[PDB]
């Protein structure tokens, strides 16, 4: 690969680079520095490359095309950059040329070929329909792909990728005025979409994820009006009758229930309050560690329950001794027993945890402190098992996330959002320090790799941009340094954080950043020399 080849002023130069380097090299342009994206995605290049792609797509004879894969990938990479990069903007004559190229591939007699090579280029064409804002233009093709899909297509990884792209089109169409005004009249699309979701052969198969996406997008169609409405309702009713919320086809049931509940009247479908019933079905095990920790789980062994409870119990004692809490909670906090809710896998978390706890699941777990002062507030850590999680409990992120419960109840006044000063360095640093103690090679490694942060910088840390090195490793280093070298200062700070005097907390740590920077550097030196 040579990403600089895509920066030439000459469109023919850029075309030749796309052809010679191929899709795996074009990948770099999605993440390239702005100078590269600005040069590669000039309006003139997008137009000229689209015009070349049109002729090549017309000539396509099936069996895949490395060049067409790379060309369509480039075009939709341009729309990706245009969306995110303020210095990439397209003139109005760009998108019609791109639409012409997509048309040429769609109208080619080979468009519905079933093969992995064809799927590689077809995938990029289907995604371009969304990236280029053409969701209103190919609904007959979306319908055809939905009804043509079968077990033969489903054998091929890249055909699964490609046809799964039609759910991206339907989702992205929400922002397309022409799509919004026509989709509700597409009775044949609605029938095909529902019948795709109802295809029993998808359950447990390589394409189950597509059937679940179909159910979710079908439920989303209830936000529109038009002649297709009764078909959408009828197909959703059939989904809710054919499958169930916990059991066979529940990925499809729950996918449809998610968007129906959000955009429609749950009472029209008989699914109001399914989330409370779902919780009892999925989190069917209950294991009380102690008055301060109870586990609800989907499918854990007795040995895992015992190990989770003892590991958390050890952290609990180490926390209370280290933070000198006297086991006295902050005021206005009645989160007396943490509920630890553990699903059987990341996939189960993604399916069931969303509706049960009203959370997003595109993550590795989350702790919901809630409103600690409100009667009936429940503190919920929501998690899953994973094969590469820590023995002997195998609960992902358990040891770190558990400390957030303790810190929130005994150190930090108020709910999660109460602080009016930045406290990420403390929250994440204390979770790392209590859970890992002095075993943290990654924190040693970031001192000696050419990039360090001052105490001043660490205290300003936020979650914006999610700098894991800064948040987790340098938060740990600052916290550990303060406990080892300035414990009385930490106790002074906790007087303020425990009652929500955030301005006082900031003034306290401001003094640390002025006074202690050179000692912090010496303490880092000692850590590095110990490693050697």
């Amino acid at each position: 690969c040579d990403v600089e080849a895509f920066t030439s002023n000459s469109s023919n130069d850029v075309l030749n680079a796309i052809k010679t380097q191929g899709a795996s090299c074009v990948n770099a342009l999605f993440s390239a520095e702005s100078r590269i994206q600005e040069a590669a995605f000039e309006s003139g290049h997008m137009y000229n490359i689209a015009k070349h792609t049109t002729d090549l797509a017309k000539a396509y004879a099936g069996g895949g095309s490395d060049e067409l894969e790379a060309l369509f990938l480039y075009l939709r990479a341009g729309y990706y950059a245009e969306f995110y990069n303020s210095k990439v903007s397209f003139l109005s004559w760009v998108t019609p040329a791109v639409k012409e190229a997509v048309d040429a591939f769609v109208n080619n007699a080979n468009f519905y070929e079933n093969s992995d090579p064809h799927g590689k280029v077809l995938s990029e064409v289907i995604i371009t329909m969304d990236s280029a804002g053409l969701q209103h233009a190919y609904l007959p093709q979306v319908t055809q792909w939905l009804t043509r899909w079968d077990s033969q297509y489903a054998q091929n990884w890249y055909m699964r990728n490609a046809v799964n792209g039609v759910f991206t089109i339907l989702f992205g169409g929400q922002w397309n005025e022409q799509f919004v005004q026509t989709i509700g009249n597409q009775t044949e699309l609605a029938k095909a979409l529902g019948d795709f979701a109802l295809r029993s052969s998808a359950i447990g198969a390589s394409d189950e994820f597509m059937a679940a996406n179909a159910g979710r997008e079908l439920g989303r169609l209830t936000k529109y009006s038009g002649s297709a409405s009764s078909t959408v309702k009828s197909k959703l009713t059939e989904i809710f009758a054919q499958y169930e919320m916990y059991g066979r086809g529940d990925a499809i049931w729950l996918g449809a229930a998610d968007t129906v509940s959000y955009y429609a009247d749950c009472s029209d479908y008989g699914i109001c309050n399914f989330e409370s019933q779902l919780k009892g079905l999925v989190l069917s095990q209950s294991y009380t560690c102690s008055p301060t920790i109870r586990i609800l789980s989907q499918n854990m062994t007795q040995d895992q329950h015992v190990a989770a409870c003892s590991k958390m119990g050890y952290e609990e004692g180490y926390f209370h001794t280290s933070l000198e809490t006297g086991r006295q909670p902050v005021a206005d906090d009645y989160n007396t027993q943490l509920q630890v809710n553990i699903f059987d896998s990341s996939d189960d978390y993604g399916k069931y945890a969303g509706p049960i706890f009203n959370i997003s699941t595109n993550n590795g777990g989350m702790y919901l402190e809630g409103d600690p002062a409100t009667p009936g507030n429940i503190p919920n850590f929501v998690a899953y098992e994973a094969p590469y999680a820590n023995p002997d409990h195998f609960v992902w992120n358990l040891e770190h996330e558990y400390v957030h419960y303790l810190d929130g109840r005994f150190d930090l006044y108020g709910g999660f959002g109460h602080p009016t000063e930045r406290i990420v360095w403390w929250s994440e640093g204390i979770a790392e320090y209590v859970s890992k103690e002095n075993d943290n090679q990654a924190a040693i490694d970031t001192i000696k790799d050419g990039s360090t942060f001052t105490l001043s910088e660490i205290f300003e840390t936020s979650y914006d941009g999610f700098d894991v090195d800064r948040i987790y490793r340098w938060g740990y280093l600052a916290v550990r340094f303060m406990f080892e070298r300035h414990k009385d200062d930490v106790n002074q700070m906790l007087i303020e954080t425990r009652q929500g005097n955030w301005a006082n907390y900031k003034a306290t740590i401001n003094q640390w950043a002025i006074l202690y920077q050179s000692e912090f550097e010496q303490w880092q030196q000692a850590l590095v020399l110990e490693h050697h």
């Binding site: 990884w157 799964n164 994820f209 979710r216 993604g350 595109n362 993550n363 590795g364 989350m366 590469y388």
Partner: peptide, 14 residues
């Protein structure tokens, strides 16, 4: 919110 064919298991907490 459509899922891709591959999702990541070992994510940081939210």
């Amino acid at each position: 919110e459509p899922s891709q064919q591959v999702t990541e298991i070992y994510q940081h907490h939210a």
